[PDB]
Structures are given as structure tokens and as C-alpha cells.
Design a protein around this ligand. Sequence first.
Ligand code: K
Ligand code: K
Ligand code: K
Ligand code: K
Ligand code: K
Ligand code: K
Ligand code: K
Ligand code: K
Ligand code: K
Ligand code: K
Ligand code: K
Ligand code: K
Ligand code: MG
Ligand code: MG
Ligand code: MG
Ligand code: MG
Ligand code: MG
Ligand code: MG
Ligand code: MG
Ligand code: MG
Ligand code: MG
Ligand code: MG
Ligand code: MG
Ligand code: MG
Ligand code: MG
Ligand code: MG
Ligand code: MG
Ligand code: MG
Ligand code: MG
Ligand code: MG
Ligand code: MG
Ligand code: MG
Ligand code: MG
Ligand code: MG
Ligand code: MG
Ligand code: MG
Ligand code: MG
Lengths: 79, 205, 86, 79
Amino acid sequence: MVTIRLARHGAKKRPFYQVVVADSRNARNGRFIERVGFFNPIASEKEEGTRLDLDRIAHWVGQGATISDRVAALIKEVN
Amino acid sequence: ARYLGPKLKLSRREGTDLFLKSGVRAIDTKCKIEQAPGQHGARKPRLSDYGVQLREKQKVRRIYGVLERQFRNYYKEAARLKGNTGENLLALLEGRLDNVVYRMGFGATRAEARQLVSHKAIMVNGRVVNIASYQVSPNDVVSIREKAKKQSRVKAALELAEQREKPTWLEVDAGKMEGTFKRKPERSDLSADINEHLIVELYSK
Amino acid sequence: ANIKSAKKRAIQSEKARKHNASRRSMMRTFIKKVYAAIEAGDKAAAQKAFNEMQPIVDRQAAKGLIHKNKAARHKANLTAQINKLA
Amino acid sequence: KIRTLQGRVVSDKMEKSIVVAIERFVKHPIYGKFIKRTTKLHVHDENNECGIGDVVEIRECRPLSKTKSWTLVRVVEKA
RNA sequence: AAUUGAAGAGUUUGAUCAUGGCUCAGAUUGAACGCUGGCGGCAGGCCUAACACAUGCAAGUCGAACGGUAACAGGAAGAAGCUUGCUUCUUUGCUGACGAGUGGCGGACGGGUGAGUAAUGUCUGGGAAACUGCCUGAUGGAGGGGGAUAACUACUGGAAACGGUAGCUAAUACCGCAUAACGUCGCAAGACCAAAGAGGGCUCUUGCCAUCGGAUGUGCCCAGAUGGGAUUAGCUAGUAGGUGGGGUAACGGCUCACCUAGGCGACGAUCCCUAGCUGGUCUGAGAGGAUGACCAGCCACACUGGAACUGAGACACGGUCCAGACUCCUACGGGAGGCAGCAGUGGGGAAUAUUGCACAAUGGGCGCAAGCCUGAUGCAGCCAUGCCGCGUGUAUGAAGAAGCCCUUCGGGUUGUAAAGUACUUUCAGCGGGGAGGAAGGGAGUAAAGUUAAUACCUUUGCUCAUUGACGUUACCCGCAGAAGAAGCACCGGCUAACUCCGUGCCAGCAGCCGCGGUAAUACGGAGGGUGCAAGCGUUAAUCGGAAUUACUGGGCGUAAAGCGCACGCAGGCGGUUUGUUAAGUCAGAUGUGAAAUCCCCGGGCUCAACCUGGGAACUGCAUCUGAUACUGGCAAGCUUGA
RNA sequence: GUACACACCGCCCGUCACACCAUGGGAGUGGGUUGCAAAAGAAGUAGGUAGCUUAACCUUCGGGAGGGCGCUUACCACUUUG
Ligand SMILES: [K+]
Ligand SMILES: [K+]
Ligand SMILES: [K+]
Ligand SMILES: [K+]
Ligand SMILES: [K+]
Ligand SMILES: [K+]
Ligand SMILES: [K+]
Ligand SMILES: [K+]
Ligand SMILES: [K+]
Ligand SMILES: [K+]
Ligand SMILES: [K+]
Ligand SMILES: [K+]
Ligand SMILES: [Mg+2]
Ligand SMILES: [Mg+2]
Ligand SMILES: [Mg+2]
Ligand SMILES: [Mg+2]
Ligand SMILES: [Mg+2]
Ligand SMILES: [Mg+2]
Ligand SMILES: [Mg+2]
Ligand SMILES: [Mg+2]
Ligand SMILES: [Mg+2]
Ligand SMILES: [Mg+2]
Ligand SMILES: [Mg+2]
Ligand SMILES: [Mg+2]
Ligand SMILES: [Mg+2]
Ligand SMILES: [Mg+2]
Ligand SMILES: [Mg+2]
Ligand SMILES: [Mg+2]
Ligand SMILES: [Mg+2]
Ligand SMILES: [Mg+2]
Ligand SMILES: [Mg+2]
Ligand SMILES: [Mg+2]
Ligand SMILES: [Mg+2]
Ligand SMILES: [Mg+2]
Ligand SMILES: [Mg+2]
Ligand SMILES: [Mg+2]
Ligand SMILES: [Mg+2]
């Protein structure tokens, strides 16, 4: 089904995650429907580690999109 | 990745002092600056337009101790940067941590400044930077490490710097052995001997 | 088959094939009866056959042997032909 | 409105079908000269109204045959 | 703010100008080879045989669907050597669990490759006749029965693979019946169609069926675009259209019968050759040209040819059936197999890596969950293959030392170069410290919700242990000592850099022009020099320079080039005025133009490469609303062309 | 005037002879690909039904319906011929 999950970009040993809405069947870094935010695990202080479009996420949840565990944790920490 | 050969030969080829020695003694006493190096150095062959352009580029490289690949990248950056490419190029070379350390008087020569930077004796904004090519922004503070403050070389270099003309764009405090890069040097601040237009033309060849 | 689930799948698909074919054959037999009655030209016989067929096509659609659209087509096609027979 | 094309009938021989030529003026990609280009469409004509040389308006529809996905709207001009 | 953009040279002649080809300087690469080689970061790495493949691994999971109990780990009970209260030995699915089996879901994803395909592909823009597991909204239902079957047991056929016969048994397996309408068929009246339980403590949770929605995915249609060849010009009978029947989820010659004779093509049909397409990439001032490796989208393929079955979805890489070539097993009757998953082997080749580690993170399958599976992925190994960073010391040092080379023997040069002297310790080495990638999950604890219930379950705080493959991590600190760290091409002109000796049209060099026959800056060595530098050269290949296919941006009296002349269809183009239209054109708006990339302004790794936020751009296409000069259409003229 | 420039003792054309290289024709010969006209018919699917057989439904308990197997036909891969 439609899911909200983290696509792993960035460089080796320095992960950067794009938060995307995707058909779950597609590859992690493959075809996605929409980008709704990002998560930087190693973001420096004074730099925004996580940004999420809650309105777009909420819209997709309304349409029955599931949320990955990590994205759910990120939503909690954001709000 | 660095030139380790005799320094004065480079100045002799260029025909001008490249400040590759401390300047404690005159270059003329140290070498025959006028004569080009080697057996046929006394002969002065006519130089082609390409030759003139090449020699200007080599001079600037030899002054700052930059190899061709890095120098080419500087040119490309200067051309990309808005404004005068030739002026941008000289500004980039001036912004190098290596050059800044020498101009602040912490190093007697750019090579000496290089060793200081490389050997982690230099801090920028209170953080240790050991990269010669590091670009210093305006309002950055360059200071010697407390451990390295005791070094005799640094004190000697400061004395030599007093003899030399003081850069307007750099504010340096001796004893404290810290300096501030107030602004990027203007073309007027740099020597008019260098003809940057020849370098820009050469890279358009 | 190299993989265990594939081996099991082959057995289950074969069992499913036999079950489906039997139902598919039966459904077609009843549909053929309606067409035969229409060919005969007996409206009453055609309607009687149609009435026996209708529950079968509907149920098989529900079972997923055929699509509901296919069941609808069979009913629609036959109804039109029987009405013309009148 | 409904998207329509206007063209000249070039064949009316088929039963309930016509071949219509649509003219398009296109700038040449390299040379930049405006050139006339022709597209021929098989069109459904229920009443066989249209005749060769007629100017007609046609609209896109569901496939009606192997080569027909357009239908006649009106006959703008008779030959 | 998203810009800033454009170099020539050599060579035809006795000399000249022009023309014109050839050649060179640049940038680039999945490179290869030769010589050389310190370190790190990031990335890349079978371009050839879509050749053949040893071995291991790449798809399972669910006991909260089911009969069970092969294990093991207990328990209980009963016997026991009798620790005289444990131990041993049996029985008992009794329980934690759990082999094999039934059933569910997954196996159509993820991963590989580019053979085929010049369009049943791709790209852009539209469109109608569809279906869509899991997810999600709404409204209802969820009654009552039946016949089986695997496992198992007995027997039995085979060398094996794989079976056969009989008996027994369960379900969320299977099949009636009831129920039946915002469902299906029907003008209507009517007719017809489903379901499944399981778990926790009556209640809660979850599952099941029906219909209608959404979302996602997918099928289908149209227009434009998308290689080369005319020394391929005609092609086509399901062909093109119609009518009716059948078929599909769905429109449709999709199929068939009948009818009509169409349909396509110089705006290149058909045939031949080549080729996966795109975002992009390289080059270029641009316009172009070339290209499609990595990354992402789409397509196609899975030993070869063919076929269906199951399923929401496949005509299915690690499924089924058939045929074939290959390899293999065999008791000769008959069997088995498919690395273009990862690693690896042989082979081919100028040439391309380890039979590594881990599921810690991200993501995927199954599961209530714990978890299990995951060669996806994260990492590590190998390789200067590329990009980027850094080091190989640094000041002082005339004795202008030796030694070399050159020399008119005065000297000059190597060269401040080396010694010598004074310092520094990056990196490498040794030692000691030490982030972050970790979110969650598990126990408890309280409140709230729920309910008959302070139960259970859910939610949210709370508390306590705990989860890192990389890993001897990044990073930091200390120690010792210049120690452990420079090569490659070139020096006649183009083209930066010159002499001596050897050789004597030889040996050899060579991109072009050329060089070599005894005073060679051109061969070979040496001294010196130039350019690059952990690389440097050479070869291959693309674009550039080439305005040398010229759209931007060229020519045709004599350099290559006006058809021998003319008429003329198609085509291109067309005097002047008014009105009208608004097609071109222009303006604005809207939708779309995937993300990445490129560009601009920023942020993060000590810098950079690299990573990343936002913007700009995507020059296009469609639609809507306007403008009407020009062009086109239409109407009416006009007289100057005819 | 010139096609000469160590400059008419200049320049320069073709056959013939010898060597070598690429290429056309050539009795034909051997491969690849492919058109046309036929032959062929594994498996599968669909249509039909000599026969054989059959859990669930129906039944008057005899059977019936329906199903399966077999057989047959159509389509078609291998393959074959001109
Ligand atoms: K299973
Ligand atoms: K030329
Ligand atoms: K291909
Ligand atoms: K057809
Ligand atoms: K038809
Ligand atoms: K392109
Ligand atoms: K194939
Ligand atoms: K399914
Ligand atoms: K994992
Ligand atoms: K032109
Ligand atoms: K007009
Ligand atoms: K010959
Ligand atoms: Mg480097
Ligand atoms: Mg089990
Ligand atoms: Mg069921
Ligand atoms: Mg019923
Ligand atoms: Mg190919
Ligand atoms: Mg150009
Ligand atoms: Mg099916
Ligand atoms: Mg498979
Ligand atoms: Mg395989
Ligand atoms: Mg492999
Ligand atoms: Mg080999
Ligand atoms: Mg496994
Ligand atoms: Mg020169
Ligand atoms: Mg000599
Ligand atoms: Mg080249
Ligand atoms: Mg060109
Ligand atoms: Mg010309
Ligand atoms: Mg002539
Ligand atoms: Mg001529
Ligand atoms: Mg003439
Ligand atoms: Mg318009
Ligand atoms: Mg984009
Ligand atoms: Mg007009
Ligand atoms: Mg021949
Ligand atoms: Mg057959």
C-alpha cells in the first residue's frame, strides 16, 4: 500500500534520509509519489536535523497511507 | 604534491624575486638573480606570446606554491565567480590559509607558513586547521596554537614581517600571535607587477 | 522446484486447477443449454434454461471463478436473444 | 468546450467511415521556416453525410474500429 | 542571484594572394598498455561470450486458521538405585514449544541483464470503454447444515526420481441451504448472488462477507516526437470499413459469419541494416555534434522454442507442462538440471574485484507481537580507474667544496643545491583516550480510555536493565626521529626548454612539415633545461578547433559547383484597399514538464572532492482569457503586375 | 605565350616487360539470413462425445443432474520438402 518511509541518501557513513510517500513495493531509493520532508541523523547543532510537512503527511494518512516506525518517531519528536 | 627543489632557480627563471627566501639577506648576494638557471642561462632567448603567458602563470604559481591542477581549479572558480576573473583569481590565492599565515608574519616564507599549518600549529576561529588550501573568510581570526607560541621560528618571522610592508586587509597582534582577516585584499592592495590578464588569456587558449 | 514453498504452490495450484475446471465446465454446460434452447426457438425452454443458469453464473462470479462483468454479460446477452425469440 | 479538429475529407469510400486530412502549420526545428504538415484520421460518419472535398469538424472518441477513434461533429463546408 | 561569451598554427609556390584538404595545440573516458608509485576521503570497476558453469548462499513466514506431536525443555502422575528425598526409569500434547503435513499470505516485490524491439517500445500532451491484493472512509451482514482430504496407519511398485491401493481425521480447506440490495440482469414487474472463525480477560481485540467511496497500481485509445538506406516504390484479403454473434476487466478485426472494396505510400509506405528509450552525460560561446556506463523512470528478457495453470496481479529468473540442444545420474527401464541474483570457476578478451561481515541502520515478506527471513541494503576486501585533499621536510648555509658537464682553459654551470648549523613533526609507526550513526524493542509503574469489572486490551507519560556489522571508527592526546615517502614525458618549427660526445641516408626518429650520406639543438647517450607530479606518457574513442554540410554561419565566370533549353502539375512564394476571422504570431493565467543532475544563494564534513536546504531552470505541450500590426482564411474591391 | 623555376640539357604521355597491393568479371563452390507453396502436430486450451468412471446436489432410492478420464476435432512449437 501507500507508505511514508525514509529513502537513504547522503554519503557513506554520513546518512541523509528523504521522507517520501511511496508505493511500498518500490525500491527504497526508487519511484516515490511525493517528498514530504527530510531527516539528518548526524546534523550539527544549530542545523535543522528534521523537517516534515505535517499537512501533507496528514493528507496522506487520511487517504490510508501507512507510516514507517522511524517516520512515526520523527513525527512525535517534531510535535 | 609540493616542489622540493632549489628555490632560487625558480626566481632566476622568472627574473624577479619570488620571496622564496626569508629576505634576511638580499637575493643578489645569495644567487645571480638576473641570470636564468643552467648552462645556457646567460643567453636571453626571445620569448613568444605563449611564452610570455606561460611565464606569468608560472610566476604566480611559484609565489604561492600551488601545483597546476589546483591552480587550474582556482582559475575555473574565479571565472565562475562574479566580477573580474583575474582579480578573483588573485583574491582566491590570497585567501589561502598558507598565504594568510605568511602575510600575518607567523611564517618567514610561504613554505615555512605551510609547515606551520600542516603541523597543526595554526587555529582558525579557535579550531585547528592543518590544510594549506583552506580559504579564510572576512572576520576570521587566525592564531598560533599555545603550544607553538614558544617556537623560535615564529618570533623571527614576526620580526621579518615588521621589515616588510604591512597588509592593510590584515590586522595582526604580536605577542598574542593572533591575526584577523578583516577583508579580502583589493587588486590595488596586491602588487601591480603581476599581470593576471595573461593568465586568464592563457586559460582561454 | 528448488524452493519448498514453490513445491507446495505447485501442488496447491494443481488442486485449484482441478476444482476450477470442474466448476468452469459445469457453468459452461448450463450456458450452452440456454443457447441450444434459443437455437431450437422455444422461448419457454430458453427461459427455463436461463433460470437455471442465472444462479450458477452469479455464484461463480462471487466465488471468483469468473468476473461479475462476465456473469452480467452472459445474462444480458441471453436475455436479449430470448426476448428476440418471443 | 470539447476539443475538436477541422479538416478536409479526402475519402468517403468506406461505409460509415471517412478519411479526413488535418493541416498543421509547424515551425521547422532547425531551419525555422513555418511548414504545413498533414495528419490523416479515419473518422466515423454514421449517416455517410460527408463527401470528398468537404470541410468537417471531428472529435476524439472511444475506439470504434482498428483505425477509427474519431467521430464527425458537423460538416462545416460542402464540396 | 541564478551570469561572464567565441585565440589559432604548420604544410602546395622561386616568391605571392586565394582556394582547399591533411595535421597539431584543448576538453573528456567504465578505459588499456609502458614506466613509476606515500597516505587519505569520495566515487567507480566484464564495455568482449544473452559463452559454459563446480560449490555455498540470494524467499519465506504464521501454533492467535487446523489435525498434530518428530524433536527438546519442563510439568504432573506412577514405578524405581531408593540422596530416603531426591535421582533414575516409564506414562501423559499435559504444557513452553515445534519436525513433517493441511491452510493463509508472500513468492508478479526486491535483485540481474540489454538478447529482442525502429514500435503491442520510449518521451510529451490529451482521452474513454476498465480492473485493482494489502491500506483506508461509509453502511449493512456474519444463520443453519453437509460431504471430503493431507498428515497418519497398513500394504504395495521403483535403482532412483516419483509413486499405487485401502482405512481414518481437522479447519479461517471445500460445497449446498437460509438470508438479499444504494449489487447484477431487466422498460418494468420480477429473478438471482456471500460469509469464518480465532485470541485475551459478558466484554474487548482481530479476522470473514456484501455494496459504494478514496488511494495506489495496472490495462487500453489518440496526436506529435524518436536511427540510417530509394543502387528498397509500391505494400496490404482480417487486409480497410460495415452488420450481427462470440470474446475481454474494458473499447476494438480481438475473433468469426456475412456484406462492401476498401486501407497505406515520395509528409517515404514496404523492404533492408543498425538500435533498448528517457531524465541525462561529454563537447561546444551558442546553435549544434556525440553518447545513453554509474544513479533514477519506463520497456524487454530469464538455457532455446512454445504453452497454459494458479492468482488481485504472471503467460512467472531461483514455479508447472511439452519439445530441443547441452551436462549429469542409472540397476538401461528411466531420472535430474539452467548464476543475465551475490560470491566464485573455466573460457573469450587490451581489460574490469572477495567463494568477506552484519541484519546494528534504512527498506521489504510473514506474524497480534516477540521475532524469523532478506547476497535488498549497510559495511569491509581488492584495484592510482577517476576526482579531491595532504605529505615526501623547513630556515640558515659560499667553501660559491668536491664530483659532473661545458669551456675561447681565463672561467662558466650544476648551485644554497649538498654538506654544515638551527628547527618542525603533518602523515606513516608505537601508545593512550574516544563521539555519532540508536530510532526502537523488553520488563515493570501510574493515569486515562474501555467494560459488569481497579480484568484484559489500547494510549500516554514514568522507571529500570539493554540493542553497532563497520571497529583497533571519526576525532583527540602523548612519544621518537629528518627520520619512512619522486617519478614520467619533453627540449628542430608548430611548442615551454641546448649543448657535448657517439653514429654517418646506417642505426634509428616521426602527429605534420621532415631529420640521418662526418662539426645532427631532430637518431643514441650525457650534462643542462622545460612541463607535469603520485603520477607521467602512449594507444583507443567523442566533441572542439573545422565558417571543412555553413539554422545560427559558406559557396557555384576562371579554384569543386547553373540542368543544353523550355513548358508545367505537386510544392514554395506573391501588388494594393476595406471589412471580418483569429489559424499562425504576441501577452497573461492555469495544469503539466518525476526526483537526481546543471546553475544561483546558503548549510554540513578541519578544506576540498563529497553531502545537503531553498530557489532558478526544465527554452516544451495542452487549455483558458485577451491583442490584432504582420502572415494565413473568408468577403467585397482597386489597377500599378499579368 | 608557358603546364618551365638547378628554369628547354625544363616538363611530360601511353602501350609493353618485371614485382607487389586493393578491386570488377568469372564454369561455379560453400555458408548466413529470408520470401513463397506445402507437409507436420508434442503439450496446452477450447469445441464435440464410441466408451469408462463418479463424495458433496436431486431422487420415486432404481436412478438423475453435473463432473472426471479416455477418445475426437480446431489452433499451434519442434521438424520436413520444393
Ligand atoms: K506455507
Ligand atoms: K590550411
Ligand atoms: K537491447
Ligand atoms: K486483425
Ligand atoms: K465488427
Ligand atoms: K539527446
Ligand atoms: K525468449
Ligand atoms: K493472492
Ligand atoms: K534489517
Ligand atoms: K546558410
Ligand atoms: K488579419
Ligand atoms: K584479380
Ligand atoms: Mg593530487
Ligand atoms: Mg512446524
Ligand atoms: Mg473459504
Ligand atoms: Mg443463496
Ligand atoms: Mg542489441
Ligand atoms: Mg563552434
Ligand atoms: Mg485466473
Ligand atoms: Mg519466481
Ligand atoms: Mg538462477
Ligand atoms: Mg555473478
Ligand atoms: Mg585470456
Ligand atoms: Mg536462508
Ligand atoms: Mg621554444
Ligand atoms: Mg657529430
Ligand atoms: Mg583524439
Ligand atoms: Mg561545424
Ligand atoms: Mg568554400
Ligand atoms: Mg579547369
Ligand atoms: Mg570549374
Ligand atoms: Mg545555361
Ligand atoms: Mg491564435
Ligand atoms: Mg527535475
Ligand atoms: Mg488580411
Ligand atoms: Mg571476385
Ligand atoms: Mg495434440
